[PDB]
Design a protein around this nucleic acid. Sequence first.
RNA 1: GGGGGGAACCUGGGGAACUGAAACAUCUCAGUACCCAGAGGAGAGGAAAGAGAAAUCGACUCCCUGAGUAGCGGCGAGCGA
RNA 2: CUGUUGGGAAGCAGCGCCAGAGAGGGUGAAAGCCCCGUAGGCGAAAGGUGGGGGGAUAGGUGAGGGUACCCGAGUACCCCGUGGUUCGUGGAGCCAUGGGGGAAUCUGGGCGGACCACCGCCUAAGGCUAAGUACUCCGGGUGACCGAUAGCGCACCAGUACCGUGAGGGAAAGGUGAAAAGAACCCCGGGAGGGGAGUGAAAUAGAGCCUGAAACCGUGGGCUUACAAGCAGUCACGGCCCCGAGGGGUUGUGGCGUGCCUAUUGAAGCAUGAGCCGGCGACUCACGGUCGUGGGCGAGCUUAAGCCGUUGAGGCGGAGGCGUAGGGAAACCGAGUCCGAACAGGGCGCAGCGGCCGCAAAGUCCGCGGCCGUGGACCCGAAACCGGGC
RNA 3: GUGGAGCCUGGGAGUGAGGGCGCGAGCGAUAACGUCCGCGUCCGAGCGCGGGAACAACCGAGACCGCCAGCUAAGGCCCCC
RNA 4: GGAUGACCCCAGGCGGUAGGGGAGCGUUCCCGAUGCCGAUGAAGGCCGACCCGCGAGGGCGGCUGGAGGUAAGGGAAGUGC
RNA 5: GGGCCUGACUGCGAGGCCUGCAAGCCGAGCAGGGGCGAAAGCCGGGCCUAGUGAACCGGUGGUCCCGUGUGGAAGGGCCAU
Lengths: 64, 116, 202, 149
Amino acid sequence: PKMKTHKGAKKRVKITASGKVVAMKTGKRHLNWQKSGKEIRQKGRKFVLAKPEAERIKLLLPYE
Amino acid sequence: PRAKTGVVRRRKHKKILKLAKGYWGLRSKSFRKARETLFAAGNYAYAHRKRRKRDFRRLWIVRINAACRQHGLNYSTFIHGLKKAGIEVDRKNLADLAVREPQVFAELVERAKAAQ
Amino acid sequence: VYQIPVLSPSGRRELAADLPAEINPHLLWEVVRWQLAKRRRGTASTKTRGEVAYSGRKIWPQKHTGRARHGDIGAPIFVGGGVVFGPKPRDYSYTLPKKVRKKGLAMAVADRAREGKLLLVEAFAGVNGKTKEFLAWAKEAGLDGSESVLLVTGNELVRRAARNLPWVVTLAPEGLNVYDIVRTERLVMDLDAWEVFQNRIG
Amino acid sequence: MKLSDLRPNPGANKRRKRVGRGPGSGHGKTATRGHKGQKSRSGGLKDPRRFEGGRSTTLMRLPKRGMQGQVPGEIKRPRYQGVNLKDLARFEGEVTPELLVRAGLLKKGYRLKILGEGEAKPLKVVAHAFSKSALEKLKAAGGEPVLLE
RNA sequence: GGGGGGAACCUGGGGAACUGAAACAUCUCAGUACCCAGAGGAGAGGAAAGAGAAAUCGACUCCCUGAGUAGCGGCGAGCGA
RNA sequence: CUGUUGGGAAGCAGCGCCAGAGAGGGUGAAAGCCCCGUAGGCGAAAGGUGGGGGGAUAGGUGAGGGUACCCGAGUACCCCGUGGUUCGUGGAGCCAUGGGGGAAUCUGGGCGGACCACCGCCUAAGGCUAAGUACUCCGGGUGACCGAUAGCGCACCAGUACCGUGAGGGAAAGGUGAAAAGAACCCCGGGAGGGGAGUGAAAUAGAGCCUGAAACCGUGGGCUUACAAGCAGUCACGGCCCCGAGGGGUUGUGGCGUGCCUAUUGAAGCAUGAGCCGGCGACUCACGGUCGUGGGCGAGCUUAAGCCGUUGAGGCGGAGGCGUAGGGAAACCGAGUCCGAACAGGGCGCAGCGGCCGCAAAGUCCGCGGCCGUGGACCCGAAACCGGGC
RNA sequence: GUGGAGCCUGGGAGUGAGGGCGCGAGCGAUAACGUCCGCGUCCGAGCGCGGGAACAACCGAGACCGCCAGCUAAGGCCCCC
RNA sequence: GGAUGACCCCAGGCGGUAGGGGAGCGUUCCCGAUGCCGAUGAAGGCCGACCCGCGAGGGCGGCUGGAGGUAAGGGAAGUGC
RNA sequence: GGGCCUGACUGCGAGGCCUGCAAGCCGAGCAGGGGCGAAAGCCGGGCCUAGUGAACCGGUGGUCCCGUGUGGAAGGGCCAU
Ligand SMILES: [Mg+2]
Ligand SMILES: [Mg+2]
Ligand SMILES: [Mg+2]
Ligand SMILES: [Mg+2]
Ligand SMILES: [Mg+2]
Ligand SMILES: [Mg+2]
Ligand SMILES: [Mg+2]
Ligand SMILES: [Mg+2]
Ligand SMILES: [Mg+2]
Ligand SMILES: [Mg+2]
Ligand SMILES: [Mg+2]
Ligand SMILES: [Mg+2]
Ligand SMILES: [Mg+2]
Ligand SMILES: [Mg+2]
Ligand SMILES: [Mg+2]
Ligand SMILES: [Mg+2]
Ligand SMILES: [Mg+2]
Ligand SMILES: [Mg+2]
Ligand SMILES: [Mg+2]
Ligand SMILES: [Mg+2]
Ligand SMILES: [Mg+2]
Ligand SMILES: [Mg+2]
Ligand SMILES: [Mg+2]
Ligand SMILES: [Mg+2]
Ligand SMILES: [Mg+2]
Ligand SMILES: [Mg+2]
Ligand SMILES: [Mg+2]
Ligand SMILES: [Mg+2]
Ligand SMILES: [Mg+2]
Ligand SMILES: [Mg+2]
Ligand SMILES: [Mg+2]
Ligand SMILES: [Mg+2]
Ligand SMILES: [Mg+2]
Ligand SMILES: [Mg+2]
Ligand SMILES: [Mg+2]
Ligand SMILES: [Mg+2]
Ligand SMILES: [Mg+2]
Ligand SMILES: [Mg+2]
Ligand SMILES: [Mg+2]
Ligand SMILES: [Mg+2]
Ligand SMILES: [Mg+2]
Ligand SMILES: [Mg+2]
Ligand SMILES: [Mg+2]
Ligand SMILES: [Mg+2]
Ligand SMILES: [Mg+2]
Ligand SMILES: [Mg+2]
Ligand SMILES: [Mg+2]
Ligand SMILES: [Mg+2]
Ligand SMILES: [Mg+2]
Ligand SMILES: [Mg+2]
Ligand SMILES: [Mg+2]
Ligand SMILES: [Mg+2]
Ligand SMILES: [Mg+2]
Ligand SMILES: [Mg+2]
Ligand SMILES: [Mg+2]
Ligand SMILES: [Mg+2]
Ligand SMILES: [Mg+2]
Ligand SMILES: [Mg+2]
Ligand SMILES: [Mg+2]
Ligand SMILES: [Mg+2]
Ligand SMILES: [Mg+2]
Ligand SMILES: [Mg+2]
Ligand SMILES: [Mg+2]
Ligand SMILES: [Mg+2]
Ligand SMILES: [Mg+2]
Ligand SMILES: [Mg+2]
Ligand SMILES: [Mg+2]
Ligand SMILES: [Mg+2]
Ligand SMILES: [Mg+2]
Ligand SMILES: [Mg+2]
Ligand SMILES: [Mg+2]
Ligand SMILES: [Mg+2]
Ligand SMILES: [Mg+2]
Ligand SMILES: [Mg+2]
Ligand SMILES: [Mg+2]
Ligand SMILES: [Mg+2]
Ligand SMILES: [Mg+2]
Ligand SMILES: [Mg+2]
Ligand SMILES: [Mg+2]
Ligand SMILES: [Mg+2]
Ligand SMILES: [Mg+2]
Ligand SMILES: [Mg+2]
Ligand SMILES: [Mg+2]
Ligand SMILES: [Mg+2]
Ligand SMILES: [Mg+2]
Ligand SMILES: [Mg+2]
Ligand SMILES: [Mg+2]
Ligand SMILES: [Mg+2]
Ligand SMILES: [Mg+2]
Ligand SMILES: [Mg+2]
Ligand SMILES: [Mg+2]
Ligand SMILES: [Mg+2]
Ligand SMILES: [Mg+2]
Ligand SMILES: [Mg+2]
Ligand SMILES: [Mg+2]
Ligand SMILES: [Mg+2]
Ligand SMILES: [Mg+2]
Ligand SMILES: [Mg+2]
Ligand SMILES: [Mg+2]
Ligand SMILES: [Mg+2]
Ligand SMILES: [Mg+2]
Ligand SMILES: [Mg+2]
Ligand SMILES: [Mg+2]
Ligand SMILES: [Mg+2]
Ligand SMILES: [Mg+2]
Ligand SMILES: [Mg+2]
Ligand SMILES: [Mg+2]
Ligand SMILES: [Mg+2]
Ligand SMILES: [Mg+2]
Ligand SMILES: [Mg+2]
Ligand SMILES: [Mg+2]
Ligand SMILES: [Mg+2]
Ligand SMILES: [Mg+2]
Ligand SMILES: [Mg+2]
Ligand SMILES: [Mg+2]
Ligand SMILES: [Mg+2]
Ligand SMILES: [Mg+2]
Ligand SMILES: [Mg+2]
Ligand SMILES: [Mg+2]
Ligand SMILES: [Mg+2]
Ligand SMILES: [Mg+2]
Ligand SMILES: [Mg+2]
Ligand SMILES: [Mg+2]
Ligand SMILES: [Mg+2]
Ligand SMILES: [Mg+2]
Ligand SMILES: [Mg+2]
Ligand SMILES: [Mg+2]
Ligand SMILES: [Mg+2]
Ligand SMILES: [Mg+2]
Ligand SMILES: [Mg+2]
Ligand SMILES: [Mg+2]
Ligand SMILES: [Mg+2]
Ligand SMILES: [Mg+2]
Ligand SMILES: [Mg+2]
Ligand SMILES: [Mg+2]
Ligand SMILES: [Mg+2]
Ligand SMILES: [Mg+2]
Ligand SMILES: [Mg+2]
Ligand SMILES: [Mg+2]
Ligand SMILES: [Mg+2]
Ligand SMILES: [Mg+2]
Ligand SMILES: [Mg+2]
Ligand SMILES: [Mg+2]
Ligand SMILES: [Mg+2]
Ligand SMILES: [Mg+2]
Ligand SMILES: [Mg+2]
Ligand SMILES: [Mg+2]
Ligand SMILES: [Mg+2]
Ligand SMILES: [Mg+2]
Ligand SMILES: [Mg+2]
Ligand SMILES: [Mg+2]
Ligand SMILES: [Mg+2]
Ligand SMILES: [Mg+2]
Ligand SMILES: [Mg+2]
Ligand SMILES: [Mg+2]
Ligand SMILES: [Mg+2]
Ligand SMILES: [Mg+2]
Ligand SMILES: [Mg+2]
Ligand SMILES: [Mg+2]
Ligand SMILES: [Mg+2]
Ligand SMILES: [Mg+2]
Ligand SMILES: [Mg+2]
Ligand SMILES: [Mg+2]
Ligand SMILES: [Mg+2]
Ligand SMILES: [Mg+2]
Ligand SMILES: [Mg+2]
Ligand SMILES: [Mg+2]
Ligand SMILES: [Mg+2]
Ligand SMILES: [Mg+2]
Ligand SMILES: [Mg+2]
Ligand SMILES: [Mg+2]
Ligand SMILES: [Mg+2]
Ligand SMILES: [Mg+2]
Ligand SMILES: [Mg+2]
Ligand SMILES: [Mg+2]
Ligand SMILES: [Mg+2]
Ligand SMILES: [Mg+2]
Ligand SMILES: [Mg+2]
Ligand SMILES: [Mg+2]
Ligand SMILES: [Mg+2]
Ligand SMILES: [Mg+2]
Ligand SMILES: [Mg+2]
Ligand SMILES: [Mg+2]
Ligand SMILES: [Mg+2]
Ligand SMILES: [Mg+2]
Ligand SMILES: [Mg+2]
Ligand SMILES: [Mg+2]
Ligand SMILES: [Mg+2]
Ligand SMILES: [Mg+2]
Ligand SMILES: [Mg+2]
Ligand SMILES: [Mg+2]
Ligand SMILES: [Mg+2]
Ligand SMILES: [Mg+2]
Ligand SMILES: [Mg+2]
Ligand SMILES: [Mg+2]
Ligand SMILES: [Mg+2]
Ligand SMILES: [Mg+2]
Ligand SMILES: [Mg+2]
Ligand SMILES: [Mg+2]
Ligand SMILES: [Mg+2]
Ligand SMILES: [Mg+2]
Ligand SMILES: [Mg+2]
Ligand SMILES: [Mg+2]
Ligand SMILES: [Mg+2]
Ligand SMILES: [Mg+2]
Ligand SMILES: [Mg+2]
Ligand SMILES: [Mg+2]
Ligand SMILES: [Mg+2]
Ligand SMILES: [Mg+2]
Ligand SMILES: [Mg+2]
Ligand SMILES: [Mg+2]
Ligand SMILES: [Mg+2]
Ligand SMILES: [Mg+2]
Ligand SMILES: [Mg+2]
Ligand SMILES: [Mg+2]
Ligand SMILES: [Mg+2]
Ligand SMILES: [Mg+2]
Ligand SMILES: [Mg+2]
Ligand SMILES: [Mg+2]
Ligand SMILES: [Mg+2]
Ligand SMILES: [Mg+2]
Ligand SMILES: [Mg+2]
Ligand SMILES: [Mg+2]
Ligand SMILES: [Mg+2]
Ligand SMILES: [Mg+2]
Ligand SMILES: [Mg+2]
Ligand SMILES: [Mg+2]
Ligand SMILES: [Mg+2]
Ligand SMILES: [Mg+2]
Ligand SMILES: [Mg+2]
Ligand SMILES: [Mg+2]
Ligand SMILES: [Mg+2]
Ligand SMILES: [Mg+2]
Ligand SMILES: [Mg+2]
Ligand SMILES: [Mg+2]
Ligand SMILES: [Mg+2]
Ligand SMILES: [Mg+2]
Ligand SMILES: [Mg+2]
Ligand SMILES: [Mg+2]
Ligand SMILES: [Mg+2]
Ligand SMILES: [Mg+2]
Ligand SMILES: [Mg+2]
Ligand SMILES: [Mg+2]
Ligand SMILES: [Mg+2]
Ligand SMILES: [Mg+2]
Ligand SMILES: [Mg+2]
Ligand SMILES: [Mg+2]
Ligand SMILES: [Mg+2]
Ligand SMILES: [Mg+2]
Ligand SMILES: [Mg+2]
Ligand SMILES: [Mg+2]
Ligand SMILES: [Mg+2]
Ligand SMILES: [Mg+2]
Ligand SMILES: [Mg+2]
Ligand SMILES: [Mg+2]
Ligand SMILES: [Mg+2]
Ligand SMILES: [Mg+2]
Ligand SMILES: [Mg+2]
Ligand SMILES: [Mg+2]
Ligand SMILES: [Mg+2]
Ligand SMILES: [Mg+2]
Ligand SMILES: [Mg+2]
Ligand SMILES: [Mg+2]
Ligand SMILES: [Mg+2]
Ligand SMILES: [Mg+2]
Ligand SMILES: [Mg+2]
Ligand SMILES: [Mg+2]
Ligand SMILES: [Mg+2]
Ligand SMILES: [Mg+2]
Ligand SMILES: [Mg+2]
Ligand SMILES: [Mg+2]
Ligand SMILES: [Mg+2]
Ligand SMILES: [Mg+2]
């Protein structure tokens, strides 16, 4: 049967135009009161996943 | 379609079994035993091909030595004399000479003593 | 582009048609492969250890018997047991690109045309459904049966007269295909056939 | 050219790899699987694209983001597909969404929006939207923008 | 007029567990296996108190596609119009 | 048809002939023309069918205006418990209904995803309805399907023999020859068996029958062995036998020498497996994915189900899919966009080779190969769990 | 310094039980064919070859094939040899 | 070198387990085949000290066997114990 | 020790440390609006290295982005916690 899209991956990540894989930064979900503004600011960004972990998630999204 | 073993295996076994003719008991009659024996025999041949070249040289050295001591010197002296004389006739031939042509061997012993 | 002989009451005239100059043996190969593959019946089958007839009982206890361990006798390790990865019903067909097929038709005809083995005919003289009649005309056209011929025409009467010859394949013009063309030594075409051939490869 | 002459190009048809068939093949015994372990078993491992040995997976530790939607699902709103001016070059006279579809430029069920990459051409182009630069280049080029609805 | 039988097929009434989630209870396997009733050469469904946004379509059944989409989900494994 | 070899002609040779029939199977071997067939035609008194053709029958048919009589009840509707839907209590509607309450008849009622308004859609609580669809006990056709350890469990007197109280389990076993011409008679023998005779092209084709491998058992011959220490061989020389400056067999002496497999840091290992031989026995297939690769077309590429044609002929079909634009949770903007007060900074994006031509190419399609996901997914093996029966 | 060197993109793995030895430590008893690290090495995969009586890892040396040729390494040169 | 896998010359590499890659051999089946080999003997079996190939193998000759087999070149797998 | 203060900033962030991933750490500089200082300048908590917890689910303040025929609403998203 045709492959199914992983819905956990579809909701956490995006494949860019060139095939990079981009997700939100981790660490500002809670427990933020003592974190520096420099932290919360930088953690509100998007980042590129390491090549191996990126190549794996791309296979979970065969129809993107 | 189906491709059953058919003819192929019997033929492979017979190759081996023919190669194992002459062996003792099941080693020449049983395919499996024949193969185990043939493996050993392949390694033995290769090894004994290499060592046959040694086996003979040692005989040649013993024989050359026997004829040398008849003329009052030993092999280790004889070879050095030959080297100093610049004689490069090998041990296979020296031994043949020592037995077939004794006067020729005598002359070589002479030049061996003269060299030092 | 190419010059094709034509049998007419006016005599052996010539015709000019643009068939490709370049022949791609691999492409023709690919079409023939697709042809002979999509005609397969795929009716070869076997039984897995679950489709075999025997029971599902464990033939003797797991341990302590002094025999090897076994399950049911349908296991492929047993004689009479199921097969492993044997054939099942299968569809060998696939969809070769239409542009490839079309190009293949043109190429196959061109190759014969280049050999001069291609002949076009205006009409079939005295042939009316009798083999002896076709042989007359055939001989008259330089077809003594020493070369195998694919005869392509819509005149059913001409096909019926020539079908039984060992050296003749027959085809309706809608049925023209590269396998049959390559199989044969000569290609003989009805002008009406040569017309629809032009339409398919256009 | 006859049947015996029909051959595929070199490399077109390749032999399959058969493992588990003798020492000399270099693929015997273990059949390229190594020794023991889950991976060598019939069935093998868990999904290598996800499973990481029991620890929280790389994927699942990343946060989700954005509207994921709710039952009864997708909300019907109009959709727009853009096509550039450079694509519009091939045409003469008038262009409409239906024309751009047949050309294979505009997908069906999508509204047309003209975009500015490329150059404009004095044409009648009928669409639902134009980018700012699309309008400028088009008005400048002596073309006629038409606003559909 | 009924009764009982028929390899599968079909509708209905009931309905597991191994397994999968690399443990497990929700979840999965699965309304499957199986039991029972019934129908036939097919059964079911069928002529809008429908669809759902088209100012639109027009009974039902079946295939392709829409689509592994929309979504559903210890938002896990997975399920899936 | 004839000649010829042969037990046998269909082989070979000479001269012909048919073909809407040169599919195929037989016939003493290899036959278009000997046989059965094949192409092409023909055929039902009787029974079954009859969806097509014809004919009856039942049934079917107006328009304004007034009247407000009728339009399916423990129903709709609301609440509680649940099922169904992709929907797992979620904003949870819709469809269904076990308990409680409980209407109305067109100004009536249900629905468009809580709810309300607006705008639209529809007519609940009665029933029937072909065809397109599923299946294969049965009949036929066809195989890059099997060929007696295969293929159904059964090619054969098999759901049998046999096992089991029972549910239930469940085998083995095909072949003389062209034709029985299946060996009259005689001999030894109680018979069995054999020896002659006879049949046959062939009888180590003799019914315990095609071929007749291997382990295994024996007879005869050559070489060799009773002072010798061994994974059994191997290398050298010599003796003997054989076949005719060479070779084959054998082995006396000398040298060297720790089985195969598996598992292990490490095995000849006193660690696993294997009595020996023969046959069966394990990395496949589908769909999807990801690279590579052979070709086709290239800002484009490609069809799916189906329809037509063929009866090993291909074509049609553009619905749809992938690509041509990205960025954003989104509204939205767009060669840009997001964050931002920013025209700041940053994230993620944007830009062929030669003389109009040729070449190459994004991309996409088909084949092929590697690997991956989903299924038993390389094969064999549990202890157990569940259902229904015995 | 041109090497079965190095760097970049991608396909395919296997391994994730090591072991002896030398040197540097901890642990142990200035014990273990002990144990746990470090640097190196070999065996692993060189149970192929010469030496060490025999003996994976000590000394010598990296076995493409052939030769009844020659030179050497470790170790040896009374006889077994 | 010659111009292309035409063959020759010079040079260097070539222990190998897990494992990656490459080139081949053979088995059943399809196209080639309305053909070709075949009773002056098919397949299969038993020999061989002969020929070709590194090898897997392929030839040739003798005996058996008595009716099938199948090339160059391609295709597909129930393909080697 | 004292005075004035709230930079225990908002918007970003070149370039690096570390490093399998994910994290962790350091940070010049630009814009907004401040603090202290005559100024040069310093200030994006604390001499430094511990005082911690990824996702999922949910609460609260804001934003006013989606709102299932349309206006709202229910419910989500985004920023902060
Ligand atoms: Mg938050
Ligand atoms: Mg939050
Ligand atoms: Mg702090
Ligand atoms: Mg701060
Ligand atoms: Mg803060
Ligand atoms: Mg912020
Ligand atoms: Mg898609
Ligand atoms: Mg897309
Ligand atoms: Mg067999
Ligand atoms: Mg074998
Ligand atoms: Mg065999
Ligand atoms: Mg044989
Ligand atoms: Mg062989
Ligand atoms: Mg012997
Ligand atoms: Mg010998
Ligand atoms: Mg013996
Ligand atoms: Mg014996
Ligand atoms: Mg024997
Ligand atoms: Mg060998
Ligand atoms: Mg040697
Ligand atoms: Mg040796
Ligand atoms: Mg030497
Ligand atoms: Mg030497
Ligand atoms: Mg010696
Ligand atoms: Mg002396
Ligand atoms: Mg010297
Ligand atoms: Mg010398
Ligand atoms: Mg088939
Ligand atoms: Mg098949
Ligand atoms: Mg079958
Ligand atoms: Mg089977
Ligand atoms: Mg099986
Ligand atoms: Mg079974
Ligand atoms: Mg079973
Ligand atoms: Mg069964
Ligand atoms: Mg049974
Ligand atoms: Mg069972
Ligand atoms: Mg059971
Ligand atoms: Mg059972
Ligand atoms: Mg036992
Ligand atoms: Mg036993
Ligand atoms: Mg057992
Ligand atoms: Mg079993
Ligand atoms: Mg079974
Ligand atoms: Mg059987
Ligand atoms: Mg079977
Ligand atoms: Mg069977
Ligand atoms: Mg099998
Ligand atoms: Mg299997
Ligand atoms: Mg299979
Ligand atoms: Mg099929
Ligand atoms: Mg395929
Ligand atoms: Mg197909
Ligand atoms: Mg014919
Ligand atoms: Mg024919
Ligand atoms: Mg032909
Ligand atoms: Mg034909
Ligand atoms: Mg293949
Ligand atoms: Mg091999
Ligand atoms: Mg390999
Ligand atoms: Mg290997
Ligand atoms: Mg093995
Ligand atoms: Mg591998
Ligand atoms: Mg592997
Ligand atoms: Mg193993
Ligand atoms: Mg292990
Ligand atoms: Mg492993
Ligand atoms: Mg293990
Ligand atoms: Mg791994
Ligand atoms: Mg299994
Ligand atoms: Mg497993
Ligand atoms: Mg854990
Ligand atoms: Mg979405
Ligand atoms: Mg809906
Ligand atoms: Mg104009
Ligand atoms: Mg009944
Ligand atoms: Mg009944
Ligand atoms: Mg039911
Ligand atoms: Mg009931
Ligand atoms: Mg129950
Ligand atoms: Mg369970
Ligand atoms: Mg299962
Ligand atoms: Mg399961
Ligand atoms: Mg799973
Ligand atoms: Mg489980
Ligand atoms: Mg598990
Ligand atoms: Mg458990
Ligand atoms: Mg279920
Ligand atoms: Mg049921
Ligand atoms: Mg019944
Ligand atoms: Mg019906
Ligand atoms: Mg029907
Ligand atoms: Mg009605
Ligand atoms: Mg789609
Ligand atoms: Mg999730
Ligand atoms: Mg379900
Ligand atoms: Mg005669
Ligand atoms: Mg005759
Ligand atoms: Mg003749
Ligand atoms: Mg015919
Ligand atoms: Mg015939
Ligand atoms: Mg015939
Ligand atoms: Mg013939
Ligand atoms: Mg024949
Ligand atoms: Mg015949
Ligand atoms: Mg007929
Ligand atoms: Mg007929
Ligand atoms: Mg009226
Ligand atoms: Mg009324
Ligand atoms: Mg009503
Ligand atoms: Mg309601
Ligand atoms: Mg309810
Ligand atoms: Mg539910
Ligand atoms: Mg519900
Ligand atoms: Mg929810
Ligand atoms: Mg609901
Ligand atoms: Mg209700
Ligand atoms: Mg109720
Ligand atoms: Mg109303
Ligand atoms: Mg009302
Ligand atoms: Mg309702
Ligand atoms: Mg409502
Ligand atoms: Mg509605
Ligand atoms: Mg209303
Ligand atoms: Mg409605
Ligand atoms: Mg009808
Ligand atoms: Mg029907
Ligand atoms: Mg049917
Ligand atoms: Mg049948
Ligand atoms: Mg067969
Ligand atoms: Mg057959
Ligand atoms: Mg049998
Ligand atoms: Mg059988
Ligand atoms: Mg047999
Ligand atoms: Mg039967
Ligand atoms: Mg049987
Ligand atoms: Mg019992
Ligand atoms: Mg009984
Ligand atoms: Mg049983
Ligand atoms: Mg049996
Ligand atoms: Mg017979
Ligand atoms: Mg007979
Ligand atoms: Mg008597
Ligand atoms: Mg008597
Ligand atoms: Mg008596
Ligand atoms: Mg008698
Ligand atoms: Mg007798
Ligand atoms: Mg007799
Ligand atoms: Mg006679
Ligand atoms: Mg004869
Ligand atoms: Mg015989
Ligand atoms: Mg016979
Ligand atoms: Mg016999
Ligand atoms: Mg026979
Ligand atoms: Mg016998
Ligand atoms: Mg025998
Ligand atoms: Mg004897
Ligand atoms: Mg003594
Ligand atoms: Mg003696
Ligand atoms: Mg000798
Ligand atoms: Mg001799
Ligand atoms: Mg010896
Ligand atoms: Mg040893
Ligand atoms: Mg072995
Ligand atoms: Mg073990
Ligand atoms: Mg062990
Ligand atoms: Mg151990
Ligand atoms: Mg031993
Ligand atoms: Mg042992
Ligand atoms: Mg022992
Ligand atoms: Mg063990
Ligand atoms: Mg073992
Ligand atoms: Mg036994
Ligand atoms: Mg034995
Ligand atoms: Mg594979
Ligand atoms: Mg491809
Ligand atoms: Mg193409
Ligand atoms: Mg097309
Ligand atoms: Mg797709
Ligand atoms: Mg997006
Ligand atoms: Mg903003
Ligand atoms: Mg930017
Ligand atoms: Mg091109
Ligand atoms: Mg692939
Ligand atoms: Mg892979
Ligand atoms: Mg499965
Ligand atoms: Mg499987
Ligand atoms: Mg099992
Ligand atoms: Mg349970
Ligand atoms: Mg339990
Ligand atoms: Mg029970
Ligand atoms: Mg029970
Ligand atoms: Mg290297
Ligand atoms: Mg390297
Ligand atoms: Mg790599
Ligand atoms: Mg690979
Ligand atoms: Mg591989
Ligand atoms: Mg391992
Ligand atoms: Mg491992
Ligand atoms: Mg480990
Ligand atoms: Mg470890
Ligand atoms: Mg260990
Ligand atoms: Mg350790
Ligand atoms: Mg020292
Ligand atoms: Mg130490
Ligand atoms: Mg210490
Ligand atoms: Mg002491
Ligand atoms: Mg140790
Ligand atoms: Mg120590
Ligand atoms: Mg120590
Ligand atoms: Mg070490
Ligand atoms: Mg190892
Ligand atoms: Mg060593
Ligand atoms: Mg090494
Ligand atoms: Mg030694
Ligand atoms: Mg040594
Ligand atoms: Mg020694
Ligand atoms: Mg030794
Ligand atoms: Mg040692
Ligand atoms: Mg030691
Ligand atoms: Mg020397
Ligand atoms: Mg020395
Ligand atoms: Mg000594
Ligand atoms: Mg000394
Ligand atoms: Mg001694
Ligand atoms: Mg000495
Ligand atoms: Mg060389
Ligand atoms: Mg070397
Ligand atoms: Mg090598
Ligand atoms: Mg290993
Ligand atoms: Mg290579
Ligand atoms: Mg290969
Ligand atoms: Mg083979
Ligand atoms: Mg092959
Ligand atoms: Mg044929
Ligand atoms: Mg034939
Ligand atoms: Mg002949
Ligand atoms: Mg004959
Ligand atoms: Mg003969
Ligand atoms: Mg055969
Ligand atoms: Mg041979
Ligand atoms: Mg004979
Ligand atoms: Mg023969
Ligand atoms: Mg025949
Ligand atoms: Mg053959
Ligand atoms: Mg063939
Ligand atoms: Mg070939
Ligand atoms: Mg072909
Ligand atoms: Mg096949
Ligand atoms: Mg197999
Ligand atoms: Mg201070
Ligand atoms: Mg202060
Ligand atoms: Mg102040
Ligand atoms: Mg950085
Ligand atoms: Mg980092
Ligand atoms: Mg300032
Ligand atoms: Mg101031
Ligand atoms: Mg300042
Ligand atoms: Mg600063
Ligand atoms: Mg601190
Ligand atoms: Mg921290
Ligand atoms: Mg968290
Ligand atoms: Mg969770
Ligand atoms: Mg939340
Ligand atoms: Mg709004
Ligand atoms: Mg709304
Ligand atoms: Mg609504
Ligand atoms: Mg309002
Ligand atoms: Mg609004
Ligand atoms: Mg309000
Ligand atoms: Mg809100
Ligand atoms: Mg909100
Ligand atoms: Mg936050």
